[PDB]
Amino acid sequence: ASITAITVENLEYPAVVTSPVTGKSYFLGGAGERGLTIEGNFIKFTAIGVYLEDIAVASLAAKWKGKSSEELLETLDFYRDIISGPFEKLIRSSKIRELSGPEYSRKVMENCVAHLKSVGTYGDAEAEAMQKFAEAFKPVNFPPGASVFYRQSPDGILGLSFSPDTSIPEKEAALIENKAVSSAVLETMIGEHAVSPDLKRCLAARLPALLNEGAFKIGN
């Protein structure tokens, strides 16, 4: 029934959004902050948020209704269903400190290639996809408040969009047509080998109450 908005360093993630690209509607699964530990201070650089298409609740209901937040958090199978579920996911990275495209994209692409190799799915096609991934970021710069949108289609496509603020762009900058790569980004965020668990905790905390309703519709 009730999802709440999350604000990370004055960057707000509304509880619900609708894509001008797909016309689909998503609910906020979780949000957190990323950065680097440099010297004796942790410096925030980006805010990160994960949205799940509204139909995801009905999809996850069968296996995960009734389970507590504590149990979901310790269950890899649950996050695999989220990562690879038959619904669209939308990931928004908003900058707290200014970063060029190559600057921000470096660590993400490294984590992706690291995982793709890890699971034996990094051939020529996947390499080209990550090259195309890189190219899309190169002509971009992200002042504070600027955002990147990863649209993970369940049909094996990753759409990349860039925005000067937190609004969803009307058009996408690039389409990376590769199944393995399409889910790679989200895997590095909530997958088994994801370092920061803040988003997993957000998902574990927020989904059970929703799954109890068996379904989610925008504005009901």
C-alpha atoms as one frame of an Amber mdcrd trajectory, in Angstrom:
protein
   0.000   0.000   0.000   2.385   2.687   1.272   5.862   3.356  -0.142   7.803
   6.373   1.115  10.175   8.772  -0.627  13.879   8.732   0.232  16.161  11.776
   0.203  19.930  11.295   0.036  21.851  14.550   0.575  18.976  16.761  -0.621
  18.559  14.511  -3.673  15.005  13.180  -3.461  13.771   9.849  -4.792   9.966
   9.975  -5.054   8.034   6.897  -3.909   6.589   6.435  -7.397   7.571   7.533
 -10.915   6.348   7.058 -14.478   8.693   6.723 -17.449   8.166   9.037 -20.431
  10.104   6.383 -22.369   8.026   3.280 -21.660   4.933   4.759 -20.025   5.436
   2.221 -17.242   5.222   3.040 -13.533   7.720   2.090 -10.821   7.898   2.157
  -7.023  11.022   3.033  -5.044  12.660  -0.174  -3.833  15.582   1.514  -2.113
  18.082   4.362  -2.054  21.511   5.044  -0.571  24.794   6.909  -1.000  28.087
   5.989  -2.660  31.566   7.477  -2.531  35.189   6.746  -1.702  37.078   6.399
   1.569  39.995   8.782   1.102  42.263   9.729   4.007  40.378   9.901   7.320
  37.142  11.181   5.766  34.419   9.426   3.766  33.406  11.674   0.859  29.949
  11.263  -0.656  29.973  11.503  -4.459  26.691  10.043  -5.688  23.215   9.061
  -4.553  21.820   5.798  -5.926  18.231   4.581  -6.164  16.488   1.457  -7.442
  12.960   1.437  -8.888  10.932  -1.675  -9.716   8.076  -1.713 -12.227   4.694
  -1.860 -10.483   3.959  -5.395 -11.743   6.985  -6.664  -9.791   4.975  -7.010
  -6.584   2.559  -9.519  -8.122   5.534 -11.382  -9.600   7.366 -11.617  -6.260
   4.227 -12.325  -4.229   4.053 -16.082  -4.813   7.503 -16.890  -3.424   8.042
 -14.099  -0.905   4.701 -13.103   0.628   4.616 -13.761   4.368   8.382 -13.589
   4.835   9.801 -11.070   7.301  12.309  -8.369   6.365  14.939 -10.174   8.427
  14.523 -13.366   6.406  14.446 -11.699   2.979  17.690  -9.852   3.716  19.604
 -13.108   4.243  18.097 -14.843   1.189  20.080 -14.563  -2.051  17.280 -16.177
  -4.071  15.041 -13.205  -3.275  17.457 -10.672  -4.754  18.054 -12.913  -7.769
  14.306 -12.757  -8.414  14.513  -8.978  -8.182  17.585  -8.778 -10.421  16.217
 -11.168 -13.056  12.461 -10.875 -12.505  10.048 -10.512 -15.454   9.633  -6.766
 -14.998  11.451  -3.513 -15.727  13.877  -1.933 -13.264  15.047   1.685 -13.305
  18.232   2.792 -11.554  19.009   6.480 -10.994  22.463   7.730 -10.019  22.473
  11.383  -8.907  25.723  13.257  -8.305  26.522  15.003  -5.022  29.915  16.082
  -6.337  30.628  16.852  -9.977  31.916  13.970 -12.090  32.568  13.566 -15.799
  31.034  10.550 -17.517  34.307   8.590 -17.760  35.086   9.453 -14.131  31.803
   8.075 -12.792  31.490   5.208 -15.273  34.971   3.779 -14.611  34.189   1.942
 -11.367  30.761   0.818 -12.579  32.131  -0.760 -15.753  34.919  -2.409 -13.768
  32.391  -3.975 -11.388  30.309  -5.106 -14.365  33.195  -6.725 -16.250  34.344
  -8.256 -12.967  30.974  -9.945 -12.470  30.498 -10.930 -16.117  33.860 -12.707
 -16.051  32.997 -14.212 -12.668  29.982 -16.059 -14.090  31.556 -17.032 -17.413
  29.514 -14.671 -19.585  32.058 -12.271 -21.074  32.626 -13.035 -24.746  33.082
 -10.736 -27.735  29.446  -9.593 -27.701  29.619  -8.616 -24.033  32.939  -6.812
 -24.537  31.509  -4.705 -27.361  28.458  -3.974 -25.216  30.665  -2.608 -22.434
  32.593  -0.612 -25.037  29.305   0.870 -26.240  28.454   1.371 -22.571  31.633
   3.415 -22.151  31.122   5.508 -25.303  27.702   6.698 -24.131  29.198   8.269
 -21.002  32.188   9.958 -22.661  30.478  13.090 -24.054  28.641  13.686 -20.748
  29.463  15.620 -17.579  27.511  15.464 -14.318  27.301  18.603 -12.195  25.629
  18.234  -8.775  22.000  17.160  -9.208  22.611  15.676 -12.656  21.547  12.052
 -13.092  22.119   8.818 -14.996  19.199   6.465 -15.637  19.757   2.756 -16.240
  16.601   1.204 -17.701  16.915  -2.572 -17.369  14.325  -4.117 -19.671  13.418
  -7.749 -18.954  13.800  -8.326 -22.708  17.595  -8.128 -22.462  18.153  -4.434
 -23.238  19.845  -1.718 -21.178  18.765   1.841 -21.948  21.014   4.686 -20.793
  19.695   8.203 -20.191  21.333  11.385 -18.874  19.567  14.308 -17.175  20.674
  17.732 -15.863  18.375  17.171 -12.868  16.438  14.233 -11.356  13.731  14.086
 -14.048  13.518  11.156 -16.468  14.636  12.162 -19.995  12.174  11.868 -22.882
  14.662   9.958 -25.029  17.454   7.513 -24.237  21.070   8.209 -25.193  21.856
   4.572 -26.002  20.473   1.032 -26.120  22.855  -1.766 -25.162  21.343  -4.941
 -26.591  22.884  -7.709 -24.494  21.173  -9.951 -21.936  24.178 -10.542 -19.668
  25.140  -6.855 -19.596  21.526  -5.727 -19.180  21.343  -7.105 -15.620  25.018
  -6.529 -14.788  24.615  -3.059 -13.259  21.865  -4.043 -10.824  23.799  -7.182
  -9.898  26.718  -5.036  -8.704  24.267  -3.130  -6.476  22.076  -5.814  -4.868
  23.639  -9.044  -6.117  25.464 -11.549  -3.922  28.853  -9.871  -4.406  27.547
  -6.314  -3.993  29.744  -4.604  -1.406  27.361  -2.007   0.054  24.249  -3.658
   1.564  22.192  -0.480   2.085  19.974  -1.111  -0.951  19.446  -4.767  -0.035
  18.307  -3.634   3.412  15.970  -1.075   1.844  14.446  -3.762  -0.370  14.149
  -6.260   2.490  12.447  -3.635   4.661  10.021  -2.215   2.101   8.821  -5.217
   0.094   7.163  -7.415   2.761   4.417  -4.906   3.594   3.757  -4.454  -0.127
   3.801  -8.172  -0.943   1.082  -8.577   1.676  -1.177  -6.661  -0.704  -0.227
  -9.085  -3.476  -0.036  -6.279  -6.048   0.831  -2.618  -6.631  -0.923  -0.017
  -8.776   0.004   3.662  -9.027  -2.565   5.832  -7.252  -4.867   3.327  -5.532
